[PDB]
Amino acid sequence: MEAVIKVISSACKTYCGKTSPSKKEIGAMLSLLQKEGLLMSPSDLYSPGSWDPITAALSQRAMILGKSGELKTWGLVLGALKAAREEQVTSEQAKFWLGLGG
């Protein structure tokens, strides 16, 4: 769950700018989603299939329990993911990262 925070944080810093969430907040968001049984692996969040269910669940949390910290974080995270998904050729970007690792 450490590297996931770093990656998400990196994506947010690139796409949200100064309004970017803290690493602690991303952690709290990911931690909650795990403990809710929503994210089985933290990396499931990267796939768009999880995005609506995450939004739904975090909206429920803000409404039912009055706790909206995580939903605000997710707003920022999801904006960053959408921006990233649009702007880039996805697999060339991955090819790049695996290349640097060698």
mmCIF file with all atom_site columns, C-alpha atoms in Angstrom:
data_model
loop_
_atom_site.group_PDB
_atom_site.id
_atom_site.type_symbol
_atom_site.label_atom_id
_atom_site.label_alt_id
_atom_site.label_comp_id
_atom_site.label_asym_id
_atom_site.label_entity_id
_atom_site.label_seq_id
_atom_site.pdbx_PDB_ins_code
_atom_site.Cartn_x
_atom_site.Cartn_y
_atom_site.Cartn_z
_atom_site.occupancy
_atom_site.B_iso_or_equiv
_atom_site.pdbx_formal_charge
_atom_site.auth_seq_id
_atom_site.auth_comp_id
_atom_site.auth_asym_id
_atom_site.auth_atom_id
_atom_site.pdbx_PDB_model_num
ATOM 1   C CA . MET A 1 1   ? 0.000   0.000  0.000   1.00 0.00 ? 1   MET A CA 1
ATOM 2   C CA . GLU A 1 2   ? 3.103   2.247  0.236   1.00 0.00 ? 2   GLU A CA 1
ATOM 3   C CA . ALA A 1 3   ? 3.949   2.345  -3.502  1.00 0.00 ? 3   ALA A CA 1
ATOM 4   C CA . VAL A 1 4   ? 0.263   2.823  -4.434  1.00 0.00 ? 4   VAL A CA 1
ATOM 5   C CA . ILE A 1 5   ? 0.154   6.037  -2.340  1.00 0.00 ? 5   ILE A CA 1
ATOM 6   C CA . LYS A 1 6   ? 3.365   7.256  -4.057  1.00 0.00 ? 6   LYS A CA 1
ATOM 7   C CA . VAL A 1 7   ? 1.946   6.554  -7.539  1.00 0.00 ? 7   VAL A CA 1
ATOM 8   C CA . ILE A 1 8   ? -1.449  8.167  -6.812  1.00 0.00 ? 8   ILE A CA 1
ATOM 9   C CA . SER A 1 9   ? 0.295   11.152 -5.133  1.00 0.00 ? 9   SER A CA 1
ATOM 10  C CA . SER A 1 10  ? 2.544   11.514 -8.203  1.00 0.00 ? 10  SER A CA 1
ATOM 11  C CA . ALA A 1 11  ? -0.490  11.423 -10.552 1.00 0.00 ? 11  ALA A CA 1
ATOM 12  C CA . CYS A 1 12  ? -2.288  14.017 -8.403  1.00 0.00 ? 12  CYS A CA 1
ATOM 13  C CA . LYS A 1 13  ? 0.749   16.332 -8.289  1.00 0.00 ? 13  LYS A CA 1
ATOM 14  C CA . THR A 1 14  ? 0.974   16.170 -12.097 1.00 0.00 ? 14  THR A CA 1
ATOM 15  C CA . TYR A 1 15  ? -2.756  16.682 -12.808 1.00 0.00 ? 15  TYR A CA 1
ATOM 16  C CA . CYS A 1 16  ? -4.328  18.576 -9.870  1.00 0.00 ? 16  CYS A CA 1
ATOM 17  C CA . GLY A 1 17  ? -1.380  20.906 -9.111  1.00 0.00 ? 17  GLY A CA 1
ATOM 18  C CA . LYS A 1 18  ? -1.558  22.830 -5.808  1.00 0.00 ? 18  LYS A CA 1
ATOM 19  C CA . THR A 1 19  ? -5.066  21.546 -4.858  1.00 0.00 ? 19  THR A CA 1
ATOM 20  C CA . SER A 1 20  ? -3.503  18.022 -4.733  1.00 0.00 ? 20  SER A CA 1
ATOM 21  C CA . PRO A 1 21  ? -4.327  15.853 -1.640  1.00 0.00 ? 21  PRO A CA 1
ATOM 22  C CA . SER A 1 22  ? -1.754  14.836 0.994   1.00 0.00 ? 22  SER A CA 1
ATOM 23  C CA . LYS A 1 23  ? -0.258  11.340 1.094   1.00 0.00 ? 23  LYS A CA 1
ATOM 24  C CA . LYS A 1 24  ? -1.868  10.784 4.526   1.00 0.00 ? 24  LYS A CA 1
ATOM 25  C CA . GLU A 1 25  ? -5.302  11.536 3.019   1.00 0.00 ? 25  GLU A CA 1
ATOM 26  C CA . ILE A 1 26  ? -4.744  9.185  0.052   1.00 0.00 ? 26  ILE A CA 1
ATOM 27  C CA . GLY A 1 27  ? -3.689  6.559  2.609   1.00 0.00 ? 27  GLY A CA 1
ATOM 28  C CA . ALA A 1 28  ? -6.820  7.096  4.725   1.00 0.00 ? 28  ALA A CA 1
ATOM 29  C CA . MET A 1 29  ? -8.973  6.845  1.573   1.00 0.00 ? 29  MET A CA 1
ATOM 30  C CA . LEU A 1 30  ? -7.255  3.641  0.397   1.00 0.00 ? 30  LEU A CA 1
ATOM 31  C CA . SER A 1 31  ? -7.263  2.224  3.937   1.00 0.00 ? 31  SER A CA 1
ATOM 32  C CA . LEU A 1 32  ? -11.022 2.805  4.315   1.00 0.00 ? 32  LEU A CA 1
ATOM 33  C CA . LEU A 1 33  ? -11.834 1.335  0.883   1.00 0.00 ? 33  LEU A CA 1
ATOM 34  C CA . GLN A 1 34  ? -9.830  -1.817 1.797   1.00 0.00 ? 34  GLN A CA 1
ATOM 35  C CA . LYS A 1 35  ? -11.606 -2.120 5.168   1.00 0.00 ? 35  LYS A CA 1
ATOM 36  C CA . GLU A 1 36  ? -15.026 -1.605 3.502   1.00 0.00 ? 36  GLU A CA 1
ATOM 37  C CA . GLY A 1 37  ? -14.223 -4.656 1.336   1.00 0.00 ? 37  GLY A CA 1
ATOM 38  C CA . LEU A 1 38  ? -14.407 -2.487 -1.800  1.00 0.00 ? 38  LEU A CA 1
ATOM 39  C CA . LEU A 1 39  ? -10.773 -2.703 -2.920  1.00 0.00 ? 39  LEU A CA 1
ATOM 40  C CA . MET A 1 40  ? -9.481  -6.267 -2.739  1.00 0.00 ? 40  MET A CA 1
ATOM 41  C CA . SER A 1 41  ? -6.038  -5.123 -3.902  1.00 0.00 ? 41  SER A CA 1
ATOM 42  C CA . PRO A 1 42  ? -5.119  -1.416 -3.688  1.00 0.00 ? 42  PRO A CA 1
ATOM 43  C CA . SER A 1 43  ? -4.260  -1.522 -7.410  1.00 0.00 ? 43  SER A CA 1
ATOM 44  C CA . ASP A 1 44  ? -7.942  -2.328 -8.297  1.00 0.00 ? 44  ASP A CA 1
ATOM 45  C CA . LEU A 1 45  ? -8.520  1.433  -7.956  1.00 0.00 ? 45  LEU A CA 1
ATOM 46  C CA . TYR A 1 46  ? -6.472  2.057  -11.123 1.00 0.00 ? 46  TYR A CA 1
ATOM 47  C CA . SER A 1 47  ? -9.064  0.252  -13.277 1.00 0.00 ? 47  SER A CA 1
ATOM 48  C CA . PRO A 1 48  ? -12.125 2.342  -14.297 1.00 0.00 ? 48  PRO A CA 1
ATOM 49  C CA . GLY A 1 49  ? -14.471 -0.557 -13.368 1.00 0.00 ? 49  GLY A CA 1
ATOM 50  C CA . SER A 1 50  ? -14.039 0.424  -9.719  1.00 0.00 ? 50  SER A CA 1
ATOM 51  C CA . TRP A 1 51  ? -14.683 4.164  -10.169 1.00 0.00 ? 51  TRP A CA 1
ATOM 52  C CA . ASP A 1 52  ? -18.521 4.283  -9.984  1.00 0.00 ? 52  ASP A CA 1
ATOM 53  C CA . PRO A 1 53  ? -18.695 1.768  -7.092  1.00 0.00 ? 53  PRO A CA 1
ATOM 54  C CA . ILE A 1 54  ? -16.055 3.839  -5.202  1.00 0.00 ? 54  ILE A CA 1
ATOM 55  C CA . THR A 1 55  ? -17.998 7.084  -5.852  1.00 0.00 ? 55  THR A CA 1
ATOM 56  C CA . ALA A 1 56  ? -21.282 5.399  -4.786  1.00 0.00 ? 56  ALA A CA 1
ATOM 57  C CA . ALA A 1 57  ? -19.764 3.998  -1.583  1.00 0.00 ? 57  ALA A CA 1
ATOM 58  C CA . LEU A 1 58  ? -18.002 7.222  -0.575  1.00 0.00 ? 58  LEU A CA 1
ATOM 59  C CA . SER A 1 59  ? -21.138 9.263  -1.298  1.00 0.00 ? 59  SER A CA 1
ATOM 60  C CA . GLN A 1 60  ? -23.097 6.910  1.025   1.00 0.00 ? 60  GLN A CA 1
ATOM 61  C CA . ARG A 1 61  ? -20.441 7.450  3.702   1.00 0.00 ? 61  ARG A CA 1
ATOM 62  C CA . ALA A 1 62  ? -20.733 11.252 3.511   1.00 0.00 ? 62  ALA A CA 1
ATOM 63  C CA . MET A 1 63  ? -24.550 11.055 3.647   1.00 0.00 ? 63  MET A CA 1
ATOM 64  C CA . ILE A 1 64  ? -25.206 8.226  6.129   1.00 0.00 ? 64  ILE A CA 1
ATOM 65  C CA . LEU A 1 65  ? -22.273 8.750  8.523   1.00 0.00 ? 65  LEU A CA 1
ATOM 66  C CA . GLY A 1 66  ? -21.503 12.438 7.875   1.00 0.00 ? 66  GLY A CA 1
ATOM 67  C CA . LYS A 1 67  ? -17.849 11.621 7.150   1.00 0.00 ? 67  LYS A CA 1
ATOM 68  C CA . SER A 1 68  ? -16.797 13.189 3.849   1.00 0.00 ? 68  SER A CA 1
ATOM 69  C CA . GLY A 1 69  ? -12.982 13.461 4.136   1.00 0.00 ? 69  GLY A CA 1
ATOM 70  C CA . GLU A 1 70  ? -12.373 10.425 1.931   1.00 0.00 ? 70  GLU A CA 1
ATOM 71  C CA . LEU A 1 71  ? -14.953 11.489 -0.695  1.00 0.00 ? 71  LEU A CA 1
ATOM 72  C CA . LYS A 1 72  ? -13.184 14.843 -1.113  1.00 0.00 ? 72  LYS A CA 1
ATOM 73  C CA . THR A 1 73  ? -9.836  13.022 -1.565  1.00 0.00 ? 73  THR A CA 1
ATOM 74  C CA . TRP A 1 74  ? -11.424 10.689 -4.139  1.00 0.00 ? 74  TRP A CA 1
ATOM 75  C CA . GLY A 1 75  ? -12.794 13.689 -6.049  1.00 0.00 ? 75  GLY A CA 1
ATOM 76  C CA . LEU A 1 76  ? -9.204  14.848 -6.520  1.00 0.00 ? 76  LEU A CA 1
ATOM 77  C CA . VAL A 1 77  ? -7.774  11.327 -7.158  1.00 0.00 ? 77  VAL A CA 1
ATOM 78  C CA . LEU A 1 78  ? -10.461 10.491 -9.766  1.00 0.00 ? 78  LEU A CA 1
ATOM 79  C CA . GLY A 1 79  ? -10.010 13.836 -11.564 1.00 0.00 ? 79  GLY A CA 1
ATOM 80  C CA . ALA A 1 80  ? -6.288  13.031 -11.807 1.00 0.00 ? 80  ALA A CA 1
ATOM 81  C CA . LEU A 1 81  ? -6.918  9.475  -13.071 1.00 0.00 ? 81  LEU A CA 1
ATOM 82  C CA . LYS A 1 82  ? -9.380  10.724 -15.725 1.00 0.00 ? 82  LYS A CA 1
ATOM 83  C CA . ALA A 1 83  ? -6.932  13.431 -16.849 1.00 0.00 ? 83  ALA A CA 1
ATOM 84  C CA . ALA A 1 84  ? -4.105  10.853 -17.031 1.00 0.00 ? 84  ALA A CA 1
ATOM 85  C CA . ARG A 1 85  ? -6.283  8.331  -18.886 1.00 0.00 ? 85  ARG A CA 1
ATOM 86  C CA . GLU A 1 86  ? -7.229  10.941 -21.492 1.00 0.00 ? 86  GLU A CA 1
ATOM 87  C CA . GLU A 1 87  ? -3.896  12.715 -22.061 1.00 0.00 ? 87  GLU A CA 1
ATOM 88  C CA . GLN A 1 88  ? -1.626  9.684  -22.553 1.00 0.00 ? 88  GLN A CA 1
ATOM 89  C CA . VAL A 1 89  ? -1.109  6.614  -24.690 1.00 0.00 ? 89  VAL A CA 1
ATOM 90  C CA . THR A 1 90  ? -1.556  4.190  -21.851 1.00 0.00 ? 90  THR A CA 1
ATOM 91  C CA . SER A 1 91  ? 0.662   1.264  -22.843 1.00 0.00 ? 91  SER A CA 1
ATOM 92  C CA . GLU A 1 92  ? 3.580   3.375  -24.128 1.00 0.00 ? 92  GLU A CA 1
ATOM 93  C CA . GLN A 1 93  ? 3.578   5.073  -20.770 1.00 0.00 ? 93  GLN A CA 1
ATOM 94  C CA . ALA A 1 94  ? 3.830   1.607  -19.120 1.00 0.00 ? 94  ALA A CA 1
ATOM 95  C CA . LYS A 1 95  ? 6.569   0.574  -21.609 1.00 0.00 ? 95  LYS A CA 1
ATOM 96  C CA . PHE A 1 96  ? 8.492   3.638  -20.457 1.00 0.00 ? 96  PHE A CA 1
ATOM 97  C CA . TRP A 1 97  ? 8.211   2.722  -16.771 1.00 0.00 ? 97  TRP A CA 1
ATOM 98  C CA . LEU A 1 98  ? 9.267   -0.893 -17.289 1.00 0.00 ? 98  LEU A CA 1
ATOM 99  C CA . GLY A 1 99  ? 12.208  0.345  -19.431 1.00 0.00 ? 99  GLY A CA 1
ATOM 100 C CA . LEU A 1 100 ? 13.545  2.616  -16.657 1.00 0.00 ? 100 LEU A CA 1
ATOM 101 C CA . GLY A 1 101 ? 13.355  -0.304 -14.215 1.00 0.00 ? 101 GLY A CA 1
ATOM 102 C CA . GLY A 1 102 ? 15.895  -2.399 -16.185 1.00 0.00 ? 102 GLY A CA 1
#
